[PDB]
Amino acid sequence: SMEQVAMELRLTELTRLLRSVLDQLQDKDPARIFAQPVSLKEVPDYLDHIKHPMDFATMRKRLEAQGYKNLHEFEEDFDLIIDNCMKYNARDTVFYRAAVRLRDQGGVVLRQARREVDSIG
Numbered sequence: 001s002m003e004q005v006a007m008e009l010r011l012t013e014l015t016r017l018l019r020s021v022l023d024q025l026q027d028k029d030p031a032r033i034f035a036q037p038v039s040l041k042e043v044p045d046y047l048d049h050i051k052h053p054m055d056f057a058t059m060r061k062r063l064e065a066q067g068y069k070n071l072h073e074f075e076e077d078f079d080l081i082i083d084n085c086m087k088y089n090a091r092d093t094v095f096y097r098a099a100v101r102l103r104d105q106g107g108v109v110l111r112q113a114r115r116e117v118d119s120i121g
Contacts, residue, residue: 013120015066018074021113022063025078026056028105033098034081038088049088054080071117075110082106 029035037055038046046053059077068074085099 010121011066011069014068014070014117015063017113017116017120018063018068018071021071021074021109022056022059024109025102025106028102028109029056029098031094031098033095034085034102046088050084052080053084056081071114078106078110 026035034056036057037053038050040046054077059074059081062068062077063074068077082099082103085095089095089099
C-alpha cells in the first residue's frame with residue numbers, strides 16, 4: 001500500500017535522526033569505553049552480574065536494521081549502557097566515571113532529539 005510506504009519513509013527518517021543522535025552520543029565517549037560489548041572471554045562472569053548487556057556497536061546494528069520504533073526504545077538501550085556500567089564498576093573507577101560523564105553530556109543531545117521527534121512527528 002501507499003500507507004505502508006509512507007510509514008516506511010517515517011521509520012527511515014527516524015533512523016536517519018537516531019543515527020545522528022547515536023553519533024553525537026558516541027562522541028561523548030572519546031576513550032571508547034562503551035564502543036563494543038564487554039568481552040565474555042575477558043570478563044567471564046559478566047552475565048552473572050549484568051542481565052541485559054549493551055554497547056554502541058550493538059545499538060548501531062539494531063539501528064541499521066531499523067529496529068528502533070521510537071526514541072523511547074533507543075533511549076532504553078542508551079540507559080542500559082550507563083546503568084550496567086554503574087552497577088558492575090565501583091564509583092572510584094575510570095569506567096564508572098566515564099558513564100557518569102556520558103550520561104551528563106548525553107542529556108543535552110537527548111533533550112533536543114525528543115523535541116525534534118515530537119516536532120517532525
